[PDB]
Amino acid sequence: DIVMSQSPSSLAVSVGEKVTMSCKSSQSLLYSNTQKNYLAWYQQKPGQSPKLLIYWASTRESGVPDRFTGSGSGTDFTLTISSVKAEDLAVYYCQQYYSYPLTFGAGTKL
Amino acid sequence: KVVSTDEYVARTNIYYHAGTSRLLAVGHPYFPIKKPNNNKILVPKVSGLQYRVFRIHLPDPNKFGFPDTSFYNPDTQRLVWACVGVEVGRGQPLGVGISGHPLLNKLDDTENASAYAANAGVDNRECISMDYKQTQLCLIGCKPPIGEHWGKGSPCTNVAVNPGDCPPLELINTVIQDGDMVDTGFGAMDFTTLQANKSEVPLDICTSICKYPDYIKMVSEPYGDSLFFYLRREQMFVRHLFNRAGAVGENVPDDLYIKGSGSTANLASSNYFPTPSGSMVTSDAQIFNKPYWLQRAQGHNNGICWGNQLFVTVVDTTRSTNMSLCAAISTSETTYKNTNFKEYLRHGEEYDLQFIFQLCKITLTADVMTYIHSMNSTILEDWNFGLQPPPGGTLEDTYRFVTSQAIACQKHTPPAPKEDPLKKYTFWEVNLKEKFSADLDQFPLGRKFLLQAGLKAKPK
Amino acid sequence: WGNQLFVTVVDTTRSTNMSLCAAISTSETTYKNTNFKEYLRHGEEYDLQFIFQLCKITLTADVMTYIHSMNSTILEDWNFGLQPPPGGTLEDTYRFVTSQAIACQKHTPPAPKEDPLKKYTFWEVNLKEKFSADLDQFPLGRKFLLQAGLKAKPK
Amino acid sequence: VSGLQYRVFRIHLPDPNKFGFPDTSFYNPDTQRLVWACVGVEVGRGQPLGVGISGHPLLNKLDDTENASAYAANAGVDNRECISMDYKQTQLCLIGCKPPIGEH
Amino acid sequence: YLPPVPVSKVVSTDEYVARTNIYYHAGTSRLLAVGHPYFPIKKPNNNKILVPKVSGLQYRVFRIHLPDPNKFGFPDTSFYNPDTQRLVWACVGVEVGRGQPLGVGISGHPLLNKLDDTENASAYAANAGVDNRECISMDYKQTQLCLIGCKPPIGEHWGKGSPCTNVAVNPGDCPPLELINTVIQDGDMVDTGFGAMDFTTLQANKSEVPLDICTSICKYPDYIKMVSEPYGDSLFFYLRREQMFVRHLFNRAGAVGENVPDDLYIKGSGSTANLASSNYFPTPSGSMVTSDAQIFNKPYWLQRAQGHNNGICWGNQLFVTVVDTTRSTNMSLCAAISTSETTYKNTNFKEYLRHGEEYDLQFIFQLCKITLTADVMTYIHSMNSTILEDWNFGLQPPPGGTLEDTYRFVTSQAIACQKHTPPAPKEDPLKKYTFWEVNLKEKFSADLDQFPLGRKFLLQAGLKAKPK
Amino acid sequence: DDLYIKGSGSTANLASSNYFPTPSGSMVTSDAQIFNKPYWLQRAQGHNNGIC
Amino acid sequence: SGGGLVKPGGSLKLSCEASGFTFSSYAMSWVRQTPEKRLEWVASISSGGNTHYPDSVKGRFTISRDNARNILYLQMSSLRSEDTAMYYCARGLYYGYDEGSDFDYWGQG
């Protein structure tokens, strides 16, 4: 399949540090007829439920501050954040829905 | 199957030059200045021992169109500088810095003792300074310099490691930057990583990783473009012989020796370190500031240069002298006391560069459109014939947002001014762009070549 | 001869010995000779690149004689098992008794074939795989060209 | 391991006469043979150059012979001391098909 | 300009391939193997084998490497330019040497799930006890086969499939079955005539069969699928012979879980009130061996093969699979714990089982070259691109594009060893799959005359004289 | 401090950090003398040729 | 919604209830919890009720969609203790231009 890919496990971003995480599908993400990337994500914190991060990387959820804005198309992507903050501290799951089943990131705990 | 550049290369007849203002540079020998509570630096520690590396920023030639544009199509080709020639200004009279550490692990001399030493007080550290390997160098080429240097190896899980054990061992091979650590030959590496003591060395050399070229792998580039050139020179040897004093890593098998007793019962230092002697200097040893030349090089690159962009590096011991100040916070009293004098230091630094160049022109075939695309495509990124016809006509305006009912609120998109990938690497930078001009009649030097040329000098 | 070549070299210049310290206790802030063991390791760096030329040998008696005088073991590795042309050596040749491991191993007998100097130990390298037919691709060789020139080439 | 250790490099070549060419017709492999020849050679050495050193913790020694104000002392037992020295600087290179012959 | 106009069909490889004038041979000396028939011997606490399990009943895989021809010596190479072309081996003819005295082994199990002998029954048998299993042995069906191709042999077997889930499986319920293809691995077991499947999963008794196959999965090759390959590269050839006959008539002893409806019969009474086990199984038997049936020790000649692949071995790589029951004899020796006493004591002897194995290979090859165009490159790349990679692509552009190459710090490093502990990257993509190995790459000869087999190649084609 | 470790006793305090070399002239030779020998000019880096 | 103690090998009967909305409007699924932080996935079915099954549970997890009760259900039997997990419900939606997928809600878990 594609079990989405975030490894090796230990990295971190101190006071004023943009975050480094990379999730990469194992199938080509330039696709023929549709031509809009499909990518899913999540955030698992202490105190409430694990919850989606980002959808289509250029369209963000409301109730999601713009602080997470990623780049790239295709298998691997590049995130950029003007200022990373606390609740950015989180486990970041990653996923794609076009060809089901739904499989999960090796995960960003950054 | 790389080929020479000049296989395909198409020359110009035509040349420009620039040379810097010069170099204004100074700063402190030992460590940089900052507010004590703070991390914000007042003033840089600056040293020769900081690796000496500078890099090139230049206009696209294709930008300038010509009094005679005729001779070529800008489209069916591209138009690409070559370096014809080079010169560094290096101006200081030559100088001696020197150093060591106020605390030092040492037992003592090796050579001279009438008797075995006495007992060891703990923390016997002492203050001594030393000289260095006596050296210049120059480094010339277009791809990043990369130093290779020791590392601590990877302990595998076989031996369970015990507190204080030997770090396994490595050579690390890694990008060069400016302002990095010369060796005296104390090993190319960081004790700060790889030495617990922190009392072992000159402060400065405590800091960071000694670094040294890898010709070989720079020799080993497929294209040899890290540098196509450099020169390398030095002199030195040892001055004295001195023992460290520290807790035992390991000991010598007895069979190798005999046994003493009493006074002689006890172990003479296996910690053995020399004290180096760097040598005299001379004018003639100067390699600097002289017409500097190539045509053929070891690599296919001949003056083959990209991003209008090149890397320059050199190093010299010779000038290492600083000078300090005696600061009298009171001038009033006329009778002497050591009281009144604080001391400060900086190391002043100076250079210039004047360099000769050519342009060349490049038509287009797959090879062209590929071999380098193959080789690296980054330039045809910079060119426009990388193609890429896209899809994607239409969208929807929707306006306006400010209405306070909510359509998703929007765009983030400066996003990628980012072009230098290696930009996080941080080091000196020199933009040259508009310093170019025609005639060395006007340009103090390479008319040297123009005479090396000769050619008739043209009338008035 | 014998596909065999020797190089021996010694330098004094690189003799530098780096010395590092490990701390058995990282906590205490007061300096003590106790906390630090000492170790000594020394670096070594070599490389080899060798040009080669290719040559042939006609055979006559005088030929064969003259060699056989010099070192006769040489002939072994060629054909001419026997002085003249015919070929090689006619008792039975090849055998293997193992695969997986129970029986007294294939190496329970000694190794018949020898470099007789096998008694003499020393550092070893194998090149067998590494040859290339085009100098251009290597740093060293093009100089060989340069020394002899002889340039031109395709597009 | 130390630099002062001699180095010995043995190098095997594959049999030419197993190995052919873009064009081999120019010879009969039967009536003849093929042998390598060595035209040119290089030795790469990459370290930043510098001198090491050795010593011994116990060494037979009396005292300085260079300058002495008064005559020396009585010889005790085991006056050996810890002293070190630098070795003679040297470079060499050796090439051939037969092992280097030493003497002592 | 542009990629080409070109489809996938398959083609007869002889389309593009060119046949050369030259032939070579190499062969191993011989190969031996020894081990225990019934199970491998290991140190009892240890998992490491002291002794391997070896029998003719296990499959044998043979991987044979060839050297890159484009590195290789010829008396005359003039006929090609490496610029425009490859060279690739072609295997014209093949031998299997087998030297052992021919004879039958045997296998059995000391507790065999068994009820009684139904071949003849004079009276109603007893009632199911506890543990009536017995010590009995049998002969397996006799078999010979051979397999050749540049792709691994694909076997197949029955297996337990994931049940489609409506009803909950109660313990006791028939697991559904699934036919499963897989790569054939060395040491795998010939069928006994009991079917290619997994006893371990589907049979919990573990006493149903003799040891050798009990834990393992017997597999059988499917000519269909194998031949169904478009490129036929699994195998371009084979041969097969086998036979078996019935011997005895038994039952399984156990609870009945599919009971028999009465309508098939009438209700009995007394001893006939209870239905005896309707499980029956035959006793498989091989017959008398003959020298004639031997498929071995005789040369073979391949020119036209069913697959469009004709003797083409891609990736300097060639396979052989061999199965033989005729040499199966297991020798039994005894060693005496006391050489003193003059009275025979059972207690004095330690009985032992070992089995011999003899293999050899003698291989003929033709050399072949490939002219390159896009269509060429295309088709292959389409077929398999990997080959092109081990290959230099003759070129990536037209002058030899290179990747900012590899020059290394390794070959003997400093003993930290993530500087290697990890040697060779890439893969043999089957590296997971285990099977026997040999290297011939030093063994070639430019003269066939010297060899027993070779002259036949001449002889069969005539020698004319031997030039070139 | 982080550039070293605290001393004590004799090492309680840090000695002055400063250092400066003592320059030493070398063997003088008759050769390196640049004088008492004629000079000849034709071309100079400047455009002046011997014009005063 | 309601999941709790189940000893493996039997059948497993669970529910996912809507909360104050139209149930038939958008897609629905079941989920589980595999503690590595490496998550495993359970079940889905279409709006038209086509079974969304992976290489695993096809025909296995036996689902019953109920729009009326506004509750999602699932049947299992002869349980796989490898299915031991904290099970989660999830739902679908539609957001229609940019073609990448946000998510509004999911069940009690």
XYZ file of C-alpha atoms in Angstrom, chain E residues 5-454:
450
model
C 5.556 5.040 -32.531
C 5.844 1.162 -30.660
C 2.867 -1.265 -28.740
C 3.688 -4.596 -26.340
C 2.857 -7.818 -28.105
C 5.459 -10.285 -27.478
C 7.825 -11.196 -30.300
C 9.868 -14.218 -31.008
C 13.131 -13.089 -29.498
C 14.826 -14.164 -32.678
C 13.293 -11.059 -34.170
C 15.867 -8.687 -32.900
C 18.410 -11.046 -31.399
C 21.432 -11.907 -33.534
C 23.145 -15.257 -33.271
C 26.912 -15.277 -33.078
C 29.539 -17.625 -34.448
C 31.022 -18.588 -31.134
C 30.184 -21.004 -28.359
C 31.637 -21.650 -24.914
C 31.349 -24.068 -22.078
C 31.887 -24.201 -18.402
C 30.762 -26.600 -15.722
C 31.141 -27.311 -12.058
C 33.298 -30.159 -10.988
C 30.596 -31.783 -8.949
C 28.309 -31.004 -6.097
C 27.769 -33.094 -2.994
C 25.280 -32.814 -0.192
C 24.505 -34.855 2.898
C 21.901 -34.562 5.626
C 19.138 -36.213 7.513
C 15.993 -37.289 5.693
C 13.324 -36.867 8.306
C 14.199 -33.637 10.098
C 17.233 -31.381 10.478
C 19.399 -31.887 13.524
C 20.179 -28.883 15.675
C 21.691 -28.414 19.090
C 18.668 -29.096 21.311
C 18.674 -25.844 23.253
C 20.088 -23.956 20.281
C 18.196 -22.979 17.186
C 21.352 -23.457 15.092
C 21.456 -26.658 13.061
C 24.107 -29.189 13.833
C 22.828 -31.214 10.900
C 20.565 -30.169 8.009
C 17.609 -32.146 6.780
C 18.419 -33.566 3.369
C 16.452 -35.904 1.097
C 15.625 -36.368 -2.536
C 12.076 -35.540 -1.459
C 13.033 -31.888 -1.161
C 13.061 -29.649 -4.182
C 16.373 -28.325 -5.442
C 16.918 -24.871 -6.848
C 20.047 -23.858 -8.660
C 21.052 -20.322 -9.415
C 23.866 -19.939 -11.899
C 25.633 -16.664 -12.418
C 27.413 -15.638 -15.590
C 29.836 -12.772 -15.924
C 28.920 -9.684 -17.847
C 29.779 -10.579 -21.427
C 30.657 -7.015 -22.188
C 33.617 -7.456 -19.857
C 34.617 -10.759 -21.382
C 37.337 -12.271 -23.550
C 37.052 -13.696 -27.055
C 39.521 -14.748 -29.722
C 37.763 -12.408 -32.177
C 35.550 -9.523 -30.943
C 35.794 -7.414 -34.129
C 32.193 -8.091 -34.957
C 30.877 -5.492 -32.565
C 31.104 -2.019 -31.117
C 30.122 -1.560 -27.457
C 28.892 1.866 -28.493
C 25.829 0.606 -30.254
C 25.402 -2.803 -28.755
C 25.210 -5.266 -25.887
C 26.180 -8.862 -25.656
C 24.020 -11.446 -23.920
C 24.443 -15.149 -23.245
C 22.236 -17.704 -24.945
C 21.969 -21.236 -23.613
C 21.876 -23.779 -26.401
C 22.209 -27.000 -24.463
C 22.137 -28.308 -20.946
C 23.137 -31.361 -18.983
C 22.449 -32.850 -15.612
C 24.998 -35.274 -14.327
C 23.770 -37.714 -11.700
C 26.083 -40.416 -10.379
C 24.464 -42.117 -7.419
C 23.415 -45.761 -7.502
C 19.725 -45.693 -8.183
C 17.473 -46.962 -5.453
C 14.533 -46.217 -3.286
C 14.447 -44.594 0.108
C 11.390 -44.566 2.373
C 9.638 -42.479 5.056
C 7.015 -42.911 7.726
C 5.680 -41.709 11.023
C 5.763 -43.415 14.441
C 2.232 -42.269 15.303
C 0.058 -42.357 12.247
C -3.541 -41.309 12.389
C -5.195 -44.554 11.464
C -8.305 -46.571 12.153
C -8.030 -50.012 10.574
C -7.514 -51.860 7.294
C -10.577 -51.597 5.069
C -8.963 -53.438 2.159
C -10.311 -56.616 3.737
C -12.416 -56.748 6.891
C -13.845 -59.995 8.273
C -15.762 -58.396 11.160
C -16.875 -55.086 12.627
C -13.886 -53.278 14.119
C -13.665 -51.911 17.664
C -14.799 -48.503 18.873
C -12.658 -45.411 18.825
C -10.236 -45.491 21.752
C -7.855 -42.786 22.783
C -4.654 -42.569 20.753
C -4.642 -45.543 18.386
C -1.983 -43.914 16.173
C 0.689 -46.247 14.900
C 4.195 -46.495 13.490
C 4.045 -47.122 9.739
C 6.039 -46.114 6.648
C 5.378 -45.810 2.930
C 6.927 -45.056 -0.444
C 6.200 -41.866 -2.326
C 5.256 -41.683 -5.989
C 8.324 -41.856 -8.214
C 9.111 -38.710 -10.127
C 11.494 -36.995 -12.485
C 11.401 -33.495 -13.900
C 13.576 -30.691 -15.124
C 13.041 -27.004 -15.444
C 14.883 -24.237 -17.214
C 14.214 -20.523 -17.540
C 15.522 -17.086 -16.636
C 12.662 -16.512 -14.163
C 12.121 -18.465 -10.991
C 9.904 -21.535 -11.002
C 6.434 -20.712 -9.898
C 4.741 -23.372 -7.836
C 1.264 -23.584 -6.418
C -0.476 -25.220 -3.519
C -3.692 -25.415 -1.634
C -4.037 -23.318 1.484
C -6.474 -22.058 4.083
C -8.161 -18.884 2.893
C -9.731 -16.082 4.831
C -13.360 -17.195 5.256
C -15.938 -14.813 3.915
C -17.511 -13.639 7.074
C -21.154 -14.285 7.734
C -21.143 -17.269 10.046
C -18.757 -17.238 13.004
C -16.249 -20.057 12.854
C -16.747 -22.379 15.666
C -13.682 -24.414 16.567
C -14.288 -27.634 14.636
C -15.413 -26.085 11.373
C -13.985 -26.666 7.905
C -11.813 -23.706 6.974
C -12.408 -22.668 3.374
C -9.595 -23.396 0.977
C -7.592 -21.250 -1.406
C -5.388 -22.150 -4.311
C -2.196 -20.153 -3.981
C 0.708 -19.497 -6.306
C 4.136 -18.891 -4.841
C 7.806 -18.818 -5.668
C 9.350 -22.264 -5.454
C 12.050 -22.340 -2.761
C 14.858 -24.778 -2.203
C 14.259 -27.494 0.342
C 10.570 -27.405 -0.461
C 8.792 -30.729 -0.585
C 7.609 -32.823 -3.457
C 4.000 -33.875 -3.250
C 3.408 -37.386 -1.962
C 0.193 -37.846 -3.832
C -1.616 -36.268 -0.871
C -1.966 -32.891 -2.602
C -0.068 -29.607 -2.712
C -1.165 -27.780 0.383
C -0.246 -26.953 3.962
C -0.829 -29.759 6.398
C 0.381 -27.641 9.289
C -2.453 -25.128 9.061
C -5.183 -27.354 7.689
C -4.300 -30.464 9.716
C -4.042 -30.026 13.461
C -3.428 -33.703 14.177
C 0.150 -33.514 12.876
C 0.022 -37.349 12.788
C -1.733 -37.556 9.409
C 1.487 -37.878 7.366
C 5.085 -38.935 7.773
C 7.520 -36.437 9.170
C 9.197 -35.003 6.130
C 6.090 -33.295 4.753
C 4.264 -32.898 8.025
C 5.430 -29.397 8.871
C 6.120 -28.282 5.326
C 3.973 -27.277 2.363
C 4.174 -29.611 -0.582
C 3.908 -27.660 -3.807
C 3.372 -28.554 -7.420
C 4.138 -26.565 -10.574
C 1.312 -25.228 -12.749
C 2.260 -25.547 -16.366
C -0.642 -23.295 -17.244
C 0.321 -20.187 -15.405
C 3.979 -20.804 -16.085
C 3.292 -21.160 -19.756
C 0.805 -18.373 -19.470
C 3.655 -15.893 -19.033
C 3.775 -13.526 -22.008
C 7.507 -13.636 -22.197
C 7.666 -17.289 -21.194
C 10.694 -16.323 -19.179
C 9.633 -18.408 -16.181
C 10.688 -21.426 -18.194
C 11.209 -21.930 -21.887
C 11.431 -25.719 -21.450
C 11.006 -28.737 -19.220
C 10.362 -32.465 -19.119
C 8.369 -34.651 -16.738
C 7.797 -38.281 -15.760
C 6.106 -39.886 -12.779
C 4.072 -42.891 -11.706
C 2.266 -44.337 -8.686
C -0.176 -47.092 -7.775
C -2.533 -47.991 -4.933
C -1.392 -50.151 -2.065
C -3.599 -50.224 1.042
C -7.011 -49.022 2.245
C -7.301 -47.275 5.616
C -9.394 -44.780 7.559
C -8.869 -41.657 9.543
C -9.610 -42.122 13.241
C -11.376 -39.182 14.869
C -14.771 -37.713 15.420
C -16.968 -37.481 12.394
C -17.881 -33.914 11.766
C -19.788 -34.284 8.561
C -22.112 -37.092 9.406
C -23.662 -39.205 6.674
C -27.402 -38.810 6.078
C -29.261 -42.081 6.487
C -31.028 -41.861 3.129
C -27.827 -43.092 1.563
C -28.219 -46.224 3.603
C -30.383 -48.023 6.137
C -30.012 -47.892 9.895
C -28.077 -50.819 11.315
C -28.082 -52.192 14.832
C -25.825 -53.782 17.384
C -22.321 -53.438 16.000
C -23.999 -51.958 12.906
C -25.804 -49.296 14.922
C -22.639 -47.155 14.808
C -21.197 -45.939 11.517
C -17.474 -46.581 11.183
C -15.291 -43.743 9.923
C -16.148 -42.941 6.326
C -12.773 -41.297 6.006
C -10.669 -43.446 3.739
C -7.228 -42.860 2.458
C -5.172 -44.935 0.022
C -1.566 -45.848 0.537
C 0.574 -44.272 -2.216
C 3.128 -46.503 -3.857
C 5.855 -46.137 -6.395
C 6.768 -48.991 -8.752
C 9.948 -50.673 -9.915
C 12.632 -48.355 -11.259
C 14.303 -48.743 -14.646
C 17.406 -47.280 -16.203
C 15.270 -46.451 -19.206
C 12.994 -43.925 -17.642
C 15.997 -41.851 -16.654
C 15.684 -38.338 -17.963
C 19.199 -37.759 -16.778
C 22.664 -38.257 -18.137
C 21.550 -37.316 -21.587
C 22.118 -34.141 -23.581
C 19.300 -31.932 -24.665
C 18.954 -29.718 -27.637
C 16.833 -26.633 -27.608
C 16.159 -24.544 -30.641
C 12.457 -23.787 -30.800
C 10.741 -23.305 -27.445
C 7.129 -22.635 -26.618
C 7.818 -19.245 -25.088
C 8.869 -16.477 -27.427
C 11.984 -16.451 -25.240
C 14.445 -18.642 -27.005
C 17.207 -19.658 -24.661
C 17.686 -16.035 -23.710
C 18.934 -15.545 -20.195
C 18.515 -12.061 -18.928
C 20.607 -10.600 -16.146
C 23.640 -12.904 -16.573
C 21.251 -15.247 -14.879
C 19.952 -18.744 -15.461
C 17.915 -21.186 -13.435
C 17.511 -24.901 -13.111
C 15.078 -26.954 -11.091
C 15.498 -30.642 -10.532
C 13.394 -33.320 -8.893
C 14.406 -36.996 -8.682
C 13.073 -39.877 -6.566
C 15.222 -42.642 -8.014
C 18.371 -42.166 -5.939
C 16.303 -41.688 -2.740
C 17.973 -44.542 -0.803
C 18.799 -43.614 2.795
C 21.702 -45.516 4.287
C 21.578 -46.625 7.918
C 24.683 -47.163 10.040
C 25.107 -48.229 13.631
C 27.716 -47.325 16.208
C 28.288 -49.360 19.373
C 28.438 -47.701 22.759
C 30.391 -50.632 24.123
C 32.804 -52.594 21.962
C 33.445 -54.986 24.860
C 30.490 -57.275 25.537
C 30.177 -60.390 23.401
C 26.414 -60.614 23.888
C 24.257 -58.638 21.503
C 22.598 -55.823 23.391
C 20.103 -53.603 21.752
C 21.265 -51.031 24.315
C 24.742 -50.996 22.762
C 23.995 -49.274 19.445
C 23.189 -45.801 18.309
C 21.239 -45.886 15.074
C 21.759 -43.160 12.573
C 20.318 -41.901 9.275
C 22.176 -39.988 6.580
C 21.478 -39.467 2.882
C 23.756 -38.749 -0.066
C 23.296 -36.302 -2.934
C 25.102 -35.877 -6.228
C 24.704 -33.064 -8.714
C 26.570 -31.706 -11.668
C 25.939 -29.290 -14.462
C 27.435 -28.914 -17.902
C 26.204 -26.028 -19.948
C 26.494 -24.932 -23.487
C 26.007 -21.368 -24.466
C 25.664 -19.250 -27.525
C 26.634 -15.643 -27.504
C 24.298 -12.994 -28.823
C 24.368 -9.265 -29.471
C 21.632 -6.644 -29.472
C 21.409 -3.717 -31.828
C 19.815 -0.737 -30.144
C 17.153 1.696 -31.261
C 14.381 3.397 -29.410
C 11.953 0.640 -30.282
C 14.522 -1.696 -28.949
C 15.076 0.260 -25.834
C 11.401 0.854 -25.548
C 10.333 -2.701 -25.721
C 12.825 -3.973 -23.257
C 12.304 -1.062 -20.952
C 8.698 -2.006 -21.229
C 9.475 -5.631 -20.689
C 11.873 -5.099 -17.811
C 13.766 -1.893 -17.195
C 16.126 -3.279 -14.537
C 18.259 -5.018 -17.126
C 18.956 -1.691 -18.702
C 20.254 -0.505 -15.326
C 22.820 -3.188 -14.784
C 23.396 -2.274 -18.339
C 24.857 1.108 -19.055
C 21.939 1.792 -21.391
C 24.728 1.767 -24.024
C 23.969 5.363 -23.303
C 21.458 7.406 -21.309
C 21.706 10.468 -23.816
C 24.003 9.753 -26.797
C 27.299 10.511 -24.694
C 27.090 8.652 -21.381
C 25.296 10.798 -18.856
C 26.570 10.363 -15.343
C 25.051 10.977 -11.973
C 27.707 12.806 -9.905
C 29.317 9.513 -9.198
C 30.236 7.270 -6.351
C 33.847 7.571 -5.257
C 33.967 5.976 -1.893
C 35.525 6.135 1.539
C 34.962 2.506 2.228
C 36.608 -0.445 1.075
C 38.379 -1.023 4.415
C 37.178 1.405 7.043
C 37.839 2.267 10.697
C 35.735 -0.234 12.772
C 32.772 1.915 13.749
C 30.548 -0.072 11.430
C 27.521 1.561 10.439
C 30.472 2.001 8.199
C 29.794 -1.306 7.174
C 27.803 -3.338 9.169
C 25.585 -2.585 6.078
C 27.178 -3.926 2.869
C 25.490 -4.186 -0.481
C 22.453 -2.020 -1.153
C 20.205 -2.443 -4.182
C 18.939 -6.068 -3.950
C 18.580 -9.372 -5.450
C 14.849 -8.696 -5.330
C 14.360 -12.285 -4.328
C 16.974 -12.023 -1.595
C 14.215 -13.036 0.821
C 13.860 -16.262 -1.110
C 16.421 -18.841 -0.114
C 17.819 -21.461 -2.477
C 21.030 -23.127 -3.582
C 23.901 -21.225 -5.169
C 26.919 -21.782 -7.389
C 29.311 -19.513 -9.264
C 30.696 -20.540 -12.597
C 32.003 -17.198 -13.618
C 35.623 -18.373 -13.655
C 34.935 -21.682 -15.334
C 34.490 -20.871 -19.018
C 36.465 -22.441 -21.802
C 36.969 -21.332 -25.377
C 37.566 -24.939 -26.469
C 34.877 -27.564 -26.273
C 37.066 -30.394 -27.415
C 38.468 -30.906 -23.978
C 35.135 -31.817 -22.520
C 32.949 -34.914 -22.571
C 29.792 -33.144 -23.438
C 31.184 -30.617 -25.840
